[PDB]
């Protein structure tokens, strides 16, 4: 298996610097040259940087001229992309990809890099439980509310990621420059009444990880 794990994303003020990492595993790192690709949801995929297997040759996309610098550490088997003098037009998801001569064969999961003036905002976490008649219905839907966070993204896990089947994670709505979304689980009434159901909300930018157990609504 081939693993490419990014790190060093989040919010950075325009004109300032940010260094991205990509730790490779599962192959001979020195034998293969590697690269960096970013994705704007509008503009699409943009090649940013490459590096030779030795690390001799440093190639850059003419989309950004002499602002970024690539470097590899064949000891730690890692990428380093220093990004100096940034603009809001650089706000994208930054992937690291291994090359196999004529293409990229494997991609990382990428990191959302946001270049904004605005400060990072920690989200509020609220449980959502039905206020209607707790019926004998052998199914019930419970959800977690993530209100007012900046910027993208967040990830929600249920019972630390145990409950996966019957989980929907709804897209974020942008209102007054703050994101808000809801993730929901759908478990039987036998599950909720006996064992505890909790969601694990995580926001990298604000470095927050709050957990909220869904409790039946009393009066």
């Amino acid at each position: 298996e081939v693993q490419l794990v990014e790190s060093g994303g989040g919010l950075v003020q325009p004109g300032r610097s940010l260094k991205l990492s990509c730790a490779a595993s599962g192959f001979t790192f020195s034998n293969y040259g590697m690269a960096w690709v970013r994705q704007t949801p509008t503009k699409g995929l943009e090649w940013i940087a490459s590096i030779s297997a030795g690390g001799d040759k440093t190639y850059y996309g003419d989309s950004v001229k002499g602002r970024f610098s690539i470097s590899r550490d064949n000891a730690k088997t890692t990428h380093y992309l220093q990004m100096d003098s940034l603009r809001s037009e650089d706000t994208a998801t930054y992937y690291c990809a291994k090359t196999s001569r004529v293409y990229f064969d494997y991609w990382g999961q990428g990191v959302m890099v946001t270049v904004s003036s605005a400060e990072t905002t920690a989200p509020s976490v609220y449980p959502l439980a039905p206020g209607t008649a707790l019926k004998s219905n052998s199914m019930v839907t419970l959800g977690c509310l993530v209100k007012g966070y900046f910027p993208e993204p967040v990830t929600v896990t249920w019972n630390s990621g145990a409950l996966s089947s019957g989980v929907h994670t709804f897209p974020a709505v942008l209102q007054s420059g703050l994101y808000t979304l809801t993730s929901s689980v759908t478990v039987p009434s036998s599950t909720w009444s006996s064992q505890a159901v909790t969601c694990n909300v995580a926001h990298p930018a604000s470095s927050t990880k709050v957990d909220k157990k869904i409790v039946p609504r009393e009066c």
């Binding site: 209607t132 008649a133 707790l134 019926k135 409790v215 009393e218 009066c219």
Partner: protein
């Protein structure tokens, strides 16, 4: 909207509202404001619009309470700045949901049932039912229930209303009392 055809009898008095400012009791029948003849809710909705499109900033209020007409003073809200009086219509005390295995389920209360009395005290709103059970101290409370829809010219008939005896049980986690009745949405 069903409430526009019924008379204006105040059910809920909002907190920090203009109606609460001049102390409106939950059960005042507004017949006259400044203006304007108030017979249904549709009248008051049209009245509140035609008091801000006029630009009137001060008015008087007339209501019925215990059979008498009061003459209170009140401030006109703006229907363009997002203001209202702060009164909700009768939240009619009909059973919406019965919790499965509840002390009400153990007797035989169904949804669609209208509760008329609580220990021989007549109720008008759902909140009134809530209040009269909130301080039931977990003692045997009895209800008088009207069940089903009545045919025309028979809704004013003296029928044998089914009276049920309930025992309000405690809450396993928190430790409050619930008979297990949800309101109609």
């Amino acid at each position: 909207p069903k409430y526009l055809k019924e008379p204006v009898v105040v059910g809920y008095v909002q907190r920090d509202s203009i109606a609460q400012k001049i102390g409106i009791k939950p059960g005042d029948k507004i017949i006259k404001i400044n203006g304007y003849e108030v017979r249904t809710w549709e009248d008051l909705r049209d009245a509140l619009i035609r008091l801000s499109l006029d630009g009137v900033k001060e008015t008087t209020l007339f209501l019925e309470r215990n059979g008498e007409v009061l003459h209170l003073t009140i401030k006109v809200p703006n229907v363009q700045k997002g203001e209202e009086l702060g009164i909700a219509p009768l939240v009619k005390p009909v059973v919406g949901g019965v919790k499965k295995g509840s002390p009400a389920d153990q007797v035989g209360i169904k949804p669609g049932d209208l509760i008329l009395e609580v220990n021989g005290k007549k109720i008008n709103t759902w909140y009134e039912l809530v209040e009269e059970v909130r301080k039931s101290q977990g003692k045997a409370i009895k209800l008088k229930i009207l069940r089903g829809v009545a045919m025309p010219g028979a809704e004013d008939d003296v029928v044998k209303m089914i009276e049920k005896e309930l025992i309000p049980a405690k809450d396993p986690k928190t430790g409050t009392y619930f008979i297990g009745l949800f309101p109609k949405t």
